[PDB]
Amino acid sequence: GKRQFVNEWAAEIPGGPEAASAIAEELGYDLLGQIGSLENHYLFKHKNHPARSAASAFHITKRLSDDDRVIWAEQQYEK
Ligand code: NA
Ligand code: NA
Ligand code: NA
């Protein structure tokens, strides 16, 4: 069938793991850890957005991507 989005975001943060934790705190996420195919790819879990929704939360992605420490960000679909 079709998949819903989860309240988790992947992001590329070249500044590294300390920056990842600082970004999470500032923008309202828990850091989940490292993912992806590159070293400085991190997964975040938003502290307030619903765990599961059909909504594509483009506005949260834009806030994350708009931080200059974050060069790329992507809301994740559920598995
Ligand atoms: Na929901
Ligand atoms: Na950015
Ligand atoms: Na994106």
Author numbering: 27 to 105
Give the published text:
Proprotein convertases (PCs), including furin and PC1/3 among nine mammalian homologues, mediate the maturation of numerous secreted substrates by proteolytic cleavage. The zymogens of the furin-like PCs share a multidomain architecture comprising an N-terminal pro-domain, a subtilisin-like catalytic domain, and a P-domain (also called HomoB-domain). Activation of furin is triggered by two sequential autocatalytic cleavages and subsequent release of the prodomain. In this work, we investigate the structural and functional basis of PC-activation to engineer prodomain-based PC-inhibitors.
M2 includes three Arg-Ala mutations to prepare a stable prodomain:furin complex. Indeed, this region showed the same conformation in isolated and furin-bound M2. For the structure of isolated M2 only the positions of Cα, Cβ, and Cɣ of the side chain of Arg78 were build. In the isolated structure of M2 and in the complex structure with furin, we found an unusual interaction of the His72 side chain with the amide nitrogen atoms of Asn74 and His75. The donor-hydrogen-acceptor angle towards Asn74 (169°) indicates a stronger contribution than the less optimal angle towards His72 (155°) as determined from the isolated M2 structure. The distances between the amide nitrogen atoms and Nδ of His72 are in both cases 3.1°Å. His72 can only act as a hydrogen bond acceptor in a deprotonated state. Thus, protonation of His72 at pH 6.0 will change a productive interaction to an unfavored contact, probably destabilizing the conformation of the secondary cleavage site loop.
